[PDB]
C-alpha cells in the first residue's frame, strides 16, 4: 500500500527520552520510516522552544493534501541547519522514537509510504 493509517502518540517534549532518529538526513528519514512501520514513533507538536530541545536532523510530518476516515494525509520532510529535504504543507509535528512515554493525545494520519 502507498499509504498506511497510523495513530501516532503525541508526547510532551520534556518527556521524550530519545530526542532524534540519528545523525544524517538520510538516516533520520530511514529510521523514522522504520519506527512508523513498527509502531514505535511518537509526535511532538512544534511550539516556541520545542525544536531546540530536540536533536537535528529533525523529521517533520507535513500535510500533503486537504482527510480519509479522520486520518490527515502526511509525508516526511527532514531538516538540518535550516535546509529541508522535501517540500510539503503545514507541519503537524516533529517525529521522535517512542520508548514507552505516556502520550497526551493521538494524531490519526495517513502516511505516504
PDB file of C-alpha atoms in Angstrom:
ATOM      1  CA  UNK A   1       0.000   0.000   0.000  1.00  0.00           C
ATOM      2  CA  UNK A   2       1.231   3.549  -0.906  1.00  0.00           C
ATOM      3  CA  UNK A   3      -0.493   4.842   2.301  1.00  0.00           C
ATOM      4  CA  UNK A   4      -0.856   3.384   5.844  1.00  0.00           C
ATOM      5  CA  UNK A   5      -3.367   4.536   8.515  1.00  0.00           C
ATOM      6  CA  UNK A   6      -1.424   5.292  11.733  1.00  0.00           C
ATOM      7  CA  UNK A   7      -2.427   6.675  15.171  1.00  0.00           C
ATOM      8  CA  UNK A   8       0.704   8.486  16.496  1.00  0.00           C
ATOM      9  CA  UNK A   9       1.086   9.022  20.277  1.00  0.00           C
ATOM     10  CA  UNK A  10       1.583  12.799  20.937  1.00  0.00           C
ATOM     11  CA  UNK A  11       4.433  13.254  23.513  1.00  0.00           C
ATOM     12  CA  UNK A  12       5.328  16.326  25.643  1.00  0.00           C
ATOM     13  CA  UNK A  13       8.879  17.430  24.587  1.00  0.00           C
ATOM     14  CA  UNK A  14      10.207  17.239  28.237  1.00  0.00           C
ATOM     15  CA  UNK A  15       9.088  13.525  28.469  1.00  0.00           C
ATOM     16  CA  UNK A  16      10.972  12.435  25.317  1.00  0.00           C
ATOM     17  CA  UNK A  17      13.905  10.085  26.195  1.00  0.00           C
ATOM     18  CA  UNK A  18      15.374   9.661  22.660  1.00  0.00           C
ATOM     19  CA  UNK A  19      15.324  13.122  21.071  1.00  0.00           C
ATOM     20  CA  UNK A  20      16.036  12.191  17.409  1.00  0.00           C
ATOM     21  CA  UNK A  21      16.447   9.356  14.875  1.00  0.00           C
ATOM     22  CA  UNK A  22      20.202   9.667  14.069  1.00  0.00           C
ATOM     23  CA  UNK A  23      22.980  11.759  12.585  1.00  0.00           C
ATOM     24  CA  UNK A  24      22.252  12.329   8.820  1.00  0.00           C
ATOM     25  CA  UNK A  25      19.158  13.461   6.829  1.00  0.00           C
ATOM     26  CA  UNK A  26      19.123  10.027   5.130  1.00  0.00           C
ATOM     27  CA  UNK A  27      19.430   8.134   8.491  1.00  0.00           C
ATOM     28  CA  UNK A  28      16.665  10.085  10.337  1.00  0.00           C
ATOM     29  CA  UNK A  29      14.212   9.629   7.372  1.00  0.00           C
ATOM     30  CA  UNK A  30      15.153   5.874   7.205  1.00  0.00           C
ATOM     31  CA  UNK A  31      14.779   5.350  10.998  1.00  0.00           C
ATOM     32  CA  UNK A  32      11.536   7.436  11.114  1.00  0.00           C
ATOM     33  CA  UNK A  33      10.062   5.219   8.329  1.00  0.00           C
ATOM     34  CA  UNK A  34      11.154   2.050  10.225  1.00  0.00           C
ATOM     35  CA  UNK A  35       9.617   3.293  13.598  1.00  0.00           C
ATOM     36  CA  UNK A  36       6.380   4.380  11.810  1.00  0.00           C
ATOM     37  CA  UNK A  37       6.087   0.833  10.314  1.00  0.00           C
ATOM     38  CA  UNK A  38       6.967  -0.808  13.755  1.00  0.00           C
ATOM     39  CA  UNK A  39       4.512   1.429  15.727  1.00  0.00           C
ATOM     40  CA  UNK A  40       7.443   2.857  17.803  1.00  0.00           C
ATOM     41  CA  UNK A  41       7.159   6.501  16.572  1.00  0.00           C
ATOM     42  CA  UNK A  42       5.875   9.473  18.607  1.00  0.00           C
ATOM     43  CA  UNK A  43       4.945  13.005  17.517  1.00  0.00           C
ATOM     44  CA  UNK A  44       5.884  16.257  19.317  1.00  0.00           C
ATOM     45  CA  UNK A  45       3.730  19.300  18.397  1.00  0.00           C
ATOM     46  CA  UNK A  46       6.003  22.222  17.422  1.00  0.00           C
ATOM     47  CA  UNK A  47       5.795  25.412  19.531  1.00  0.00           C
ATOM     48  CA  UNK A  48       8.236  28.119  20.737  1.00  0.00           C
ATOM     49  CA  UNK A  49      11.260  26.388  22.356  1.00  0.00           C
ATOM     50  CA  UNK A  50      10.377  22.775  21.327  1.00  0.00           C
ATOM     51  CA  UNK A  51      12.868  22.271  18.446  1.00  0.00           C
ATOM     52  CA  UNK A  52      15.981  23.457  20.404  1.00  0.00           C
ATOM     53  CA  UNK A  53      15.147  20.681  22.988  1.00  0.00           C
ATOM     54  CA  UNK A  54      15.286  18.001  20.204  1.00  0.00           C
ATOM     55  CA  UNK A  55      18.300  16.717  18.174  1.00  0.00           C
ATOM     56  CA  UNK A  56      18.956  17.616  14.492  1.00  0.00           C
ATOM     57  CA  UNK A  57      18.475  16.396  11.894  1.00  0.00           C
ATOM     58  CA  UNK A  58      14.661  16.790  12.551  1.00  0.00           C
ATOM     59  CA  UNK A  59      11.940  14.707  10.816  1.00  0.00           C
ATOM     60  CA  UNK A  60       8.629  16.586  10.320  1.00  0.00           C
ATOM     61  CA  UNK A  61       5.270  15.189   9.244  1.00  0.00           C
ATOM     62  CA  UNK A  62       3.689  17.776   6.899  1.00  0.00           C
ATOM     63  CA  UNK A  63       0.109  17.821   5.466  1.00  0.00           C
ATOM     64  CA  UNK A  64       0.376  16.542   1.824  1.00  0.00           C
ATOM     65  CA  UNK A  65      -3.318  17.185   0.862  1.00  0.00           C
ATOM     66  CA  UNK A  66      -6.690  18.736   2.033  1.00  0.00           C
ATOM     67  CA  UNK A  67      -8.511  13.540   5.307  1.00  0.00           C
ATOM     68  CA  UNK A  68      -9.826   9.961   4.779  1.00  0.00           C
ATOM     69  CA  UNK A  69     -11.554   8.347   7.846  1.00  0.00           C
ATOM     70  CA  UNK A  70     -10.294  11.264  10.093  1.00  0.00           C
ATOM     71  CA  UNK A  71      -6.648  10.472   9.037  1.00  0.00           C
ATOM     72  CA  UNK A  72      -4.782  13.575   7.670  1.00  0.00           C
ATOM     73  CA  UNK A  73      -2.525  12.676   4.702  1.00  0.00           C
ATOM     74  CA  UNK A  74       1.123  13.463   5.583  1.00  0.00           C
ATOM     75  CA  UNK A  75       4.636  12.941   4.256  1.00  0.00           C
ATOM     76  CA  UNK A  76       8.150  13.170   5.833  1.00  0.00           C
ATOM     77  CA  UNK A  77      10.490  16.213   5.421  1.00  0.00           C
ATOM     78  CA  UNK A  78      13.915  16.285   7.214  1.00  0.00           C
ATOM     79  CA  UNK A  79      15.720  19.497   8.311  1.00  0.00           C
ATOM     80  CA  UNK A  80      19.463  20.047   9.109  1.00  0.00           C
ATOM     81  CA  UNK A  81      20.965  23.536   9.785  1.00  0.00           C
ATOM     82  CA  UNK A  82      17.908  25.295   8.238  1.00  0.00           C
ATOM     83  CA  UNK A  83      17.794  23.232   4.984  1.00  0.00           C
ATOM     84  CA  UNK A  84      14.755  20.914   4.396  1.00  0.00           C
ATOM     85  CA  UNK A  85      14.873  17.744   2.247  1.00  0.00           C
ATOM     86  CA  UNK A  86      11.369  17.545   0.907  1.00  0.00           C
ATOM     87  CA  UNK A  87       8.630  20.016   0.044  1.00  0.00           C
ATOM     88  CA  UNK A  88       5.133  19.648   1.620  1.00  0.00           C
ATOM     89  CA  UNK A  89       2.364  21.525   3.516  1.00  0.00           C
ATOM     90  CA  UNK A  90       1.921  22.635   7.152  1.00  0.00           C
ATOM     91  CA  UNK A  91       3.910  20.851   9.942  1.00  0.00           C
ATOM     92  CA  UNK A  92       1.748  18.556  12.152  1.00  0.00           C
ATOM     93  CA  UNK A  93       4.821  17.991  14.397  1.00  0.00           C
ATOM     94  CA  UNK A  94       8.327  16.525  14.759  1.00  0.00           C
ATOM     95  CA  UNK A  95       8.771  12.727  14.901  1.00  0.00           C
ATOM     96  CA  UNK A  96      10.793  11.023  17.683  1.00  0.00           C
ATOM     97  CA  UNK A  97      11.303   7.419  18.789  1.00  0.00           C
ATOM     98  CA  UNK A  98       8.590   6.280  21.248  1.00  0.00           C
ATOM     99  CA  UNK A  99      10.110   4.136  24.060  1.00  0.00           C
ATOM    100  CA  UNK A 100       7.031   3.986  26.381  1.00  0.00           C
ATOM    101  CA  UNK A 101       6.440   7.690  27.288  1.00  0.00           C
ATOM    102  CA  UNK A 102       2.749   8.374  28.244  1.00  0.00           C
ATOM    103  CA  UNK A 103       1.085  10.399  25.452  1.00  0.00           C
ATOM    104  CA  UNK A 104      -1.272  13.420  25.949  1.00  0.00           C
ATOM    105  CA  UNK A 105      -3.196  12.580  22.731  1.00  0.00           C
ATOM    106  CA  UNK A 106      -3.200  10.607  19.450  1.00  0.00           C
ATOM    107  CA  UNK A 107      -2.846  12.110  15.938  1.00  0.00           C
ATOM    108  CA  UNK A 108      -4.559   9.981  13.208  1.00  0.00           C
ATOM    109  CA  UNK A 109      -2.535  10.263   9.946  1.00  0.00           C
ATOM    110  CA  UNK A 110      -2.419   8.592   6.504  1.00  0.00           C
ATOM    111  CA  UNK A 111       1.359   8.197   5.842  1.00  0.00           C
ATOM    112  CA  UNK A 112       2.561   8.246   2.204  1.00  0.00           C
ATOM    113  CA  UNK A 113       4.942   5.196   2.430  1.00  0.00           C
TER     114      UNK A 113
END
